Amino acid sequence: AEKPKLHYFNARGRMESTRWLLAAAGVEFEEKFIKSAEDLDKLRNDGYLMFQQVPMVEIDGMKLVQTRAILNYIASKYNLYGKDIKERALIDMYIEGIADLGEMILLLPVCPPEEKDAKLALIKEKIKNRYFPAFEKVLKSHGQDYLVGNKLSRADIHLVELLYYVEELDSSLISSFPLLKALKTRISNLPTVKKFLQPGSPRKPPMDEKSLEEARKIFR
Amino acid sequence: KPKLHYFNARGRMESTRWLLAAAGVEFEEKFIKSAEDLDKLRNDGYLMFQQVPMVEIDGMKLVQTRAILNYIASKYNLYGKDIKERALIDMYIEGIADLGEMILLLPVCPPEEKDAKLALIKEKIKNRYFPAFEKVLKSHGQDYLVGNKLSRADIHLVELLYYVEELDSSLISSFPLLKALKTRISNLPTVKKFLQPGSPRKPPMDEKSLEEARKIFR
Ligand SMILES: N[C@@H](CCC(=O)N[C@@H](CS[C@H](CC=O)c1ccccc1)C(=O)NCC(=O)O)C(=O)O
Ligand SMILES: N[C@@H](CCC(=O)N[C@@H](CS[C@H](CC=O)c1ccccc1)C(=O)NCC(=O)O)C(=O)O
């Protein structure tokens, strides 16, 4: 059979959460890197992109576009999306808050430097007073190793990935949240995630301007 | 019965109203009128992220639009029949939500950006989103987007067609199969009742309602 093909460019961007999720499932995948605006145009003209956008993922006979369609399919296929509809609602509620915070962080580099540290200061405030207490409260509520159902789920994977990006932005932001610290350690120590965290994995670095201008030339 | 917590406007709650109505589910709305009433919900712990939309359903206090919709869609069997059908649906509705998001945020755009944003919305409507969804319908020829059966993808898409009509009734004119889907879904019994006067369906957001919103969300 065929292992899934990730079509993006060589950066975190909107593909990284899927890299984390497939790796944590222990699924091997290939990446076909888009290197120019002409590579993007070839995927368009070939009819591979429903909305002429990437992320695109070739899996199980489909060409899935949209971040949330790809992740939902992968999370369901590998039993990381809860056991029932109610657990799914909890998972979805949790991960969509994570998506909201992950979005602000993702779009820090290509905001006008006129507003960067105004935006960054509000990202930091929402972390300390809104998102980090919300999840710490969830972990305190049940005292189990995983956010939902006492079983590893996509919520745990998505949250811990964001914990890493929060650490990159301000390492002190986690310090008053002991249960988030512990989750971060336990999840990072799962053999699949620990491999993915070790060098030479498909995990991607933070975006420098070198790759920000590459993304500028590919997406115009 | 489900209890919808939002303010008296479309906002991020309308697509839930549409989806519940199409599934023939009666609901109550608890309208927020002040920032005071929003803080009542927050301090009472009802909002996980201190935000609405929030829906009381089946014992839970679900915030996040997509958590609400995904749960209602599965409960009332509008999420397809397997995860490959849910993946087609998800790919479709996320395109819809991308365009819907642009339209939802037009009135709150900075006034100097509004001419450009509206032009862009129309360009993507005409060249990206409507051709994408017409090609789906032309590809299998069926009356519904997925599985030859009604699903949330049809409901979300038709809802968005009404917002495109309000913005520019010419935009759908070159897309015959979208037109026919709009009328077919409009004439489904539960949807036809929702579209009629006096339903919970909300109007476009005028000036008064928009500054009601800013006061509530400080
Ligand atoms: N809802 C969808 C959205 C899909 C989407 O916006 N894809 C984009 C590339 S990501 C972006 C590009 C940089 O400027 C970036 C890359 C790095 C950092 C920040 C942003 C794209 O393909 N743009 C082409 C076009 O819109 O025509 C989904 O979640 O999948
Ligand atoms: N990801 C989440 C987001 C939830 C979300 O952003 N809720 C907001 C109200 S909607 C917005 C408010 C107007 O300024 C509006 C309403 C009408 C028109 C345009 C914008 C809220 O509660 N804001 C309080 C706060 O953030 O402190 C979800 O999709 O569910």
From Swiss-Prot, chain B:
Residue ranges of coiled coil: none
Consequence recorded when altering residue 68 to A/V: No significant effect on enzyme activity. Reduces protein stability
Domain GST C-terminal: 82-204
GO molecular function: fatty acid binding; glutathione peroxidase activity; glutathione transferase activity; steroid Delta-isomerase activity
Effect of residue 6 to F: Decreased isomerase activity
Cellular compartment(s): Cytoplasm
Annotated organism of origin: Homo sapiens
The family this protein is said to belong to: Belongs to the GST superfamily. Alpha family.
Any one biological process term the GO annotation gives: epithelial cell differentiation
Annotated ranges, domain GST N-terminal: 1-80
This protein's name: Glutathione S-transferase A1
Regulation: The isomerase activity is inhibited by S-methylglutathione (GSMe).
Gene3D superfamilies per the UniProt record, alphabetical: 1.20.1050.10, Glutaredoxin
Key word Iron-sulfur present: no
Result when mutating residue 213 to H: Confers ability to hydrolyze S-glutathionyl benzoate to glutathione and benzoic acid
